[PDB]
């Protein structure tokens, strides 16, 4: 309409400190409120809110301003922050790993972070995939007797067995052990060329579950591997499960239960298999589970750890077919306990194209939370124009077009008369500079 | 193996009160633990736990023992119970309709209930479907950019807002506008959905969308939920191909909250209080689903003691309308945005119309009934005479039942039918409990 309509539309599109829109947010803040002695750890309130319209991975990493920067710890170090959801309040660990104390002023009060949201598309996963067995003259003794009924969309198997239980000791488990057995049953009317997944629906014992499953088409049997998590495994077991066609592109090597809790649409939550306490004399613990994912290069598998103050958990790509292993290192001035079955983080999947390997590095790797970095470097580093989000901690990069649009809100309190806003990439990259952040003490828990 | 292995395996399969397995559970219980005056309501603790290994619709309805039975209220009436999840503790409304009160063992104190789990398969639904318009003014200026997998539209506009009063809404009104933008490089024969990603105003959202292939434009209909609509609006949204078999007529937001994998949660659009002088209220939203007969749409209401909400099939393309009736001894308040129930979808074939009935209907919670009748148009089928529909036991989610030790009597026993698909726990005891505070 009139030029007044043109001005209001432009003010709406460009936003303000209270409400902004971008693919990547940059915050340049000055630490205030108190001091941070060398060797201390305190929370830094960036005084900024992030919103998205669809559940996403909301990340906030320290910025690497040059492609030649290392991911080595810095004197003022910001631990990466990963939240899965639709909103987050940016509150990060600030470690003073440097030699000198932090003063209310001086050159060393300016930290910078990049915030962005990664999409969580729907990625189906087979938990109990029907792998092909490898054995052959003498085959399994057809130990279990099954009643197979074909329903509208799957095959239902009702099965009883008197299994041969074996104690397997395992110091990675809070119980220190787990009882295992295995047996086979005739495939019968089940078309083994069509089915590729199982789902347990009922069991006569509440601590017994199908751990993995194999098939042999030439022999027409299905091998089941059971796990039992109690001191006394049952003499006989009834099992009710379904055999169906899933055709998922991502499969688990073993049942994600009990260490990986399924999440809606995309990914799993990793649950601590054994309680441990990090102290300054035992500052590290390696969490490992006997499980891995196979994608056949159709998806990237990233682990996004919980936000536990004073602890640094390895984050990033998990390679296919290698046991899921994550290192937990103490980075605070105080002991931190982690309880059995407490969540350590979330595994999430990304389509083949989203993450691309940085052309200069061998492959995709994980890194401690305290070494998470993000940068905005041009596509002219696909050799060694437009800016791309590069995560050098992982040796990967993504295009800004594929990120989830952020709705940023810097709170009025954080603003000073020197605060200003900058814009790049036609508003896809917005920077909030000379805003103020508050130091906070780490809570008691 | 040996004859000893045969017995232990069979005992594992057949279960016991503490742990059994079936497709449909029948509980035959005797109400005890106090009195229930005629015309009064108390909670009945069936003292039984239901478990499933995958999220399901766990239902517990009063049993109709014969196909010739009506769904009329009975003297001792059990209100249907619907829980969505993996476990439930069966606790139901027991209404004493009929003339005389219930005393300890007065006469007939035996009520009977059927429990079962309905599957929740993954059914995608387009919230902002690109319907075809019916008939210019290219009011809004849009920047269309192609991302890796969809089309991203950045758009600014100065809309012409009109206030629409609506007494079904807690705010009494809603601001509406509409405009169009040029499709540009977007293939309107291929894309079928939108998703709002960012808006310059926190109370403005895309309500619905239409397309015209001959004009190559996309019409947007905005809603604003505040007293002062903004003069200009920035919008960032995506245009993509969803290929959902189920579409909503309007944006499910704000009255329908999307649920993971299947369905929506219906949120009360306006506070109301059921009293003895206003014992009914009709909740209605301006929305409906279109499935083209690929899915049945069922509403499973919340379990609010003393209130009976209509439950069952919702016909496609009809505004979602549910009657809420006071059945307790006390006034009940329902708050704006409180959940009223859940809409869930079922693939064609799961529910089949009962032969002899016109079509599938909903019913008040207090009239929900289930029966186990043979295929009368041999094996038993789950019939919901309240809805004129039935399902096969093979498609239900296998139950893990656990009757509490306390509920057991020395005469309690177990029954089996359908080769263990139907298990009955008979002569167990249930406790009466008072209805909790408002």
Swiss-Prot record, chain A:
Instruction: Please give the subunit comment from the record.
Output: Interacts with the host protein DAXX; this interaction takes place at ND10 and induces the reversal of DAXX-mediated repression of viral transcription. Interacts with UL35. Interacts with host TMEM173/STING1; this interaction inhibits the cGAS/STING pathway. Interacts with host RB1; this interaction mediates RB1 proteasomal degradation.
Query: Which residues does the record list as Phosphothreonine (modified residue)?
Result: 208
Disulfide bridge partners, by residue number: none
- Recorded protein name is Protein pp71
Q: Where in the cell is it found?
A: Virion tegument; Host nucleus; Host endoplasmic reticulum
Superkingdom in the source lineage: Viruses
Q: How is it modified after translation?
A: S-nitrosylation limits ability to undermine the cGAS/STING antiviral pathway.
- One Pfam family linked to the record: Herpes_UL82_83
Q: InterPro entries under this entry?
A: Herpes_UL82/UL83
Task: Give the UniProt record's GO annotations in the biological process aspect.
Answer: DNA-templated viral transcription; symbiont-mediated perturbation of host cell cycle G1/S transition checkpoint; symbiont-mediated suppression of host innate immune response
Task: PTM S-nitrosocysteine: list the residues.
Answer: 203
| Gene Ontology annotations for the cellular component aspect, listed alphabetically | host cell endoplasmic reticulum; host cell nucleus; viral tegument
Question: What functional role does this protein have?
Answer: Stimulates viral immediate-early (IE) transcription. Plays a role in the inhibition of the host innate repsonse by targeting STING1 and thus the cGAS-STING pathway. Also counteracts host DAXX-mediated repression of viral transcription. Displaces a DAXX-binding protein, ATRX, from nuclear domain 10 sites (ND10) shortly after infection. Increases the basal level of SUMOylated DAXX in infected cells. Stimulates quiescent cells to re-enter the cell cycle, proceed through G1 and enter the S phase.
Name the protein family. Answer: Belongs to the herpesviridae pp71 family.
Keywords (A to Z) from UniProt: Activator, G1/S host cell cycle checkpoint dysregulation by virus, Host endoplasmic reticulum, Host nucleus, Host-virus interaction, Inhibition of host innate immune response by virus, Modulation of host cell cycle by virus, Phosphoprotein, S-nitrosylation, Viral immunoevasion, Virion, Virion tegument
